[PDB]
Design a protein around this nucleic acid. Structure first.
Lengths: 260, 46
RNA sequence: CUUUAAUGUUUGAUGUUCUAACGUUGACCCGUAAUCCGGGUUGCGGACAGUGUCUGGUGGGUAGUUUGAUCCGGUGGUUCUGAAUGGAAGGGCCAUCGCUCAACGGAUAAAAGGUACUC
RNA sequence: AUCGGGUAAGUUCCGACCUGCACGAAUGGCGUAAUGAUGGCCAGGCUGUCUCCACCCGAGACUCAGUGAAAU
RNA sequence: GCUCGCCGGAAGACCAAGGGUUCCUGUCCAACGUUAAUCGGGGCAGGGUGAGUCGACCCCUAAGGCGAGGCCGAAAGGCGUAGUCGAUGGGAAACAGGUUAAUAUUCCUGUACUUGGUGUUACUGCGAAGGGGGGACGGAGAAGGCUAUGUUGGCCGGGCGACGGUUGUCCCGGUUUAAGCGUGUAGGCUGGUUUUCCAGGCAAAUCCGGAAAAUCAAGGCUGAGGCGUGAUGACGAGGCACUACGGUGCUGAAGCAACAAAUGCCCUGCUUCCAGGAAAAGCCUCUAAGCAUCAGGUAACAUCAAAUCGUACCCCAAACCGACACAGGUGGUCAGGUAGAGAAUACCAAGGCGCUUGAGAGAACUCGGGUGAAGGAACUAGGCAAAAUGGUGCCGUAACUUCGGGAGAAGGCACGCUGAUAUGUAGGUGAGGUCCCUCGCGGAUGGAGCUGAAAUCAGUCGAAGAUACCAGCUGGCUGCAACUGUUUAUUAAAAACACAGCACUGUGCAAACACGAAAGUGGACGUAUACGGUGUGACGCCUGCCCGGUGCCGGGAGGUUAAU
RNA sequence: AGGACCGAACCGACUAAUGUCGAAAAAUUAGCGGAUGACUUGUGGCUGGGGGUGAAAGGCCAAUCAAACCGGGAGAUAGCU
């Protein structure tokens, strides 16, 4: 749900929160947790490779399984949890054999729902099926470019891709960026669209929200001195604002249409 | 005000101790120069 | 020899297909109590991508600087010489020619500004 | 960023016009509640800021004893 | 030695880091102390630091360092695996009293506790770098139980007292006792017992997880405090005998109740919030390999060992950092009495100091203040500085507004003390007796006793009762910026910077971008609702025209175009 | 609940005064803004010089920064004092 806080004070006047009443109000599943030390934009050399990253509240990494190698094992959704690493809520899935994992929760998934992966799976949301079995003209998420990779496309909230064409061993996918990509049929994908589609409605209210979310203040180029910044060009002299940086010549064979 | 030098034995030893210097060749060269100059206090230590 | 045609040859530019080089920050097994790395199998692309030399364009992002003279010689004639011998190239001798190179005794063939952050 | 208000007296301030040297619509234009160790003006109280300074309380200043620099 | 003054959330006591004998005694004023000095943190000599229970040490680990093989790089060397280091964290254990001039949680006295080795006894399957649980965690906030602690009352010993009275409902001091042991309560968490089965826990498993059933409805875990033992012991006011007159020895009464109460414990608790809140080891359990007449483990007893290192002193300062015996800076713990909402403020207990130049006089002038006739900003670039209000309770509070605010707007009235309501009310706590009891730390009545606001009336003294310290000046117009916030350490705190929002642009993930000769990294263990860059800066109206010049995109008609 | 309100410790120095051979190579007195966070702090490390970091002032990088310090080219050059 989306709510607007009353203007009891500045910093709450413009706050819009995204409340999910069915999220688990308890500790996460410890066995699937993992430490995630913040980098602050530093690399092995210790220099700031990427700016505007630092601070923020501590967050523990959730081991979310994307490959979905449990084929032919029906499972039940125990509950839904909040994943700080992902913009979309995760779902705890318990299999019949007695093993628990974290999966990306689609829009139509709730506690107690039934899921089944593998080729022998239904068309209900949350199931994993190769595009060859999936009917053409369907919406999928968590798609793979290589078999066994795990899943790389449509992983954020409310993100999904459309299966448009079936050219033999290849399948054409339209992405949310307006890009047509050709992918092998043996790859896996998940039916439906990711949940928590209301992620846009949050506005973060004030500076502190972004500050503790992991973003540091950004300084405009004009305010910087000539030595520090060229001031449209990037801080390193690259002409931004309408210059294509795509120079690969390796994956272009899989490119069908560019963004528009 | 608090002056620049705030003593700390652990940091001093780990930043200018013999092991810290000799971990790299440059510190070994510094030690060689110190020995050539014949300074009684080769490095900082208790 | 001008003018044409099936055949076997040198072949290259381009198109389709294949794997054996090449990549795999795809998967499985071992060294291995190992997200490194290497090796064995397989799938995925594949003579593409990428890298090495040369080369066109862009490149204050960075680095060094500035704010008939001269060199070069165009042509001539002259076997004067011409690097072992004989030629030739290159120089020397006489003539002439190409720049208001006029900042005109002309310092480079090749160079504009700010500092009130200054020294 | 000429006319009226405030003072008897206002090159400041406010409101009205535009003869805009040389405002102007995201190097953004117009208002905006609340906010400000922000720029300016006015009004009520207040008082040594002033008319005009006067006295007193403590450390120096001055005398004595001991020690005892400086720039030039 | 007696007075006077100061700190007393410290100017007191412990420490952490940092110093290295500055700590005590004897001895001296050669040099130092901004003066003298017999003195000292000064000179010489002697003494002083006792640890199984404190910490280090040691087991594990985060950030991070090194890095066997390996990748890369002219060399040096850079990255990184397995591994090893790395407390700012997690792991086992002691309290009370006494003593030296200097050590004490180390020494002595009393009572204990923890980890391993060895041997005896009765049983039994043991066995991991492997698996499971726990270890193991955020912010904010309310209540209850308590306790450290303080007040009062009773009890004990003493006093009746030099200026009026004080055998009385009066004054002075004490009224303390730990760790461990057993009971386990307030409170919190969780439904248990048995059987059968399962491709899950990178092999297996009686262990965890999951699926079925039969049974009861209770059990299990955690848990401050209090109660008895510890303890007819120590301590204890005071008195007594000697003093190298500093001090030593003997003795030793009561050692209870109520109230209030913490930021400290129950509480890593409980309720909500999105910013979703370390890891490993010790610890309990299961088996793999191997052995099961062994070995090994469990339970009780006896014994041994627990090594090595620091233990002085200062630690908000004269001893540390500032060249100083420097008005500066330095992390944590304890932190009482009265008034006070309060760790503020005023005075004090414990405890510590009077800050290492003073003696005279009281000129101008300087520094910090007090008062002031009349005016009240007329001085000044500018109400700069000064001056004034300032608290509680009750009434009341404008324009605008994003409906929250403005606002404590502004502006009005009572604040002292005593008696009554009420031989102290409401409220809080709450004994003894009585009755039940699923029988003890169990439940009702009851109010004994203690504590105890707020309000009315009346009286009363003062010029003034928020009587001291503490403690907003107020309103209007207006440019700027949404606001909070940050900046030129050491002259500019702002309209500047930043900001949530907005628009453009790039990136299909071996993504773009940046550090890198390269490896490899951050982006991101994220992925188009995602990340980088650009410009503006909330919210409402909005954001009009122009593609000529320079960039960006796409094109290929036609000309130029190097290497070759 | 509040990047809420008044106000202690804590952070900083917005105004005035003293201090410029001062007690201090930016100090002291009273006012002053925040004081539950975009807060601060103890400890241990990482980012190293045409580079680091920087809510961006040409600010900080050991009292030195429009390019630190140390040793060398180096007795650099100086038509200048």
């Amino acid at each position: 749900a989306v709510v607007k806080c009353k203007p009891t004070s500045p910093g709450r006047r413009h706050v819009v929160k995204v409340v999910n009443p069915e999220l688990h109000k308890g500790k996460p599943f410890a066995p699937l947790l993992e430490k995630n030390s913040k980098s602050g934009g530093r690399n092995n050399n210790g220099r700031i490779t990427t700016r505007h990253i630092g601070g923020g509240h501590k967050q523990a990494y959730r081991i979310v399984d994307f490959k979905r190698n449990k084929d032919g094992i029906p499972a039940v959704v125990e509950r839904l949890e909040y994943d700080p690493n992902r913009s979309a809520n995760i779902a705890l899935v318990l299999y019949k054999d007695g093993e628990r994992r974290y999966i990306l929760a689609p829009k139509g998934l709730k506690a107690g729902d039934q899921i089944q992966s593998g080729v022998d799976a239904a068309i209900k949301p949350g199931n994993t099926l190769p595009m060859r079995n999936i009917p053409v003209g369907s919406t999928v998420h968590n798609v793979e470019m290589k078999p066994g990779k795990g899943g790389q496309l449509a992983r954020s909230a409310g993100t999904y891709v459309q299966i448009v064409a079936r050219d033999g061993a290849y399948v054409t996918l339209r992405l949310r960026s307006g890009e047509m990509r050709k992918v092998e049929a043996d790859c896996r994908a998940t039916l439906g669209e990711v949940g928590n589609a209301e992620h846009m409605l949050r506005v973060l209210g004030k500076a502190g929200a972004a500050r503790w979310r992991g973003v540091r203040p950004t300084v405009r180029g004009t305010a910087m001195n000539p030595v520090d910044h060229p001031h449209p060009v990037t801080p390193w002299g690259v002409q931004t604002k309408g210059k294509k940086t795509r120079s690969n010549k390796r994956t272009d064979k899989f490119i069908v249409r560019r963004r528009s | 005000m608090k002056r620049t030098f705030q003593p700390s034995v652990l940091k001093r030893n780990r930043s200018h101790g013999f092991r810290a210097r000799m971990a790299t060749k440059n510190g070994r060269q510094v030690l060689a120069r110190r020995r050539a100059k014949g300074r009684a206090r080769l490095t900082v230590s208790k």
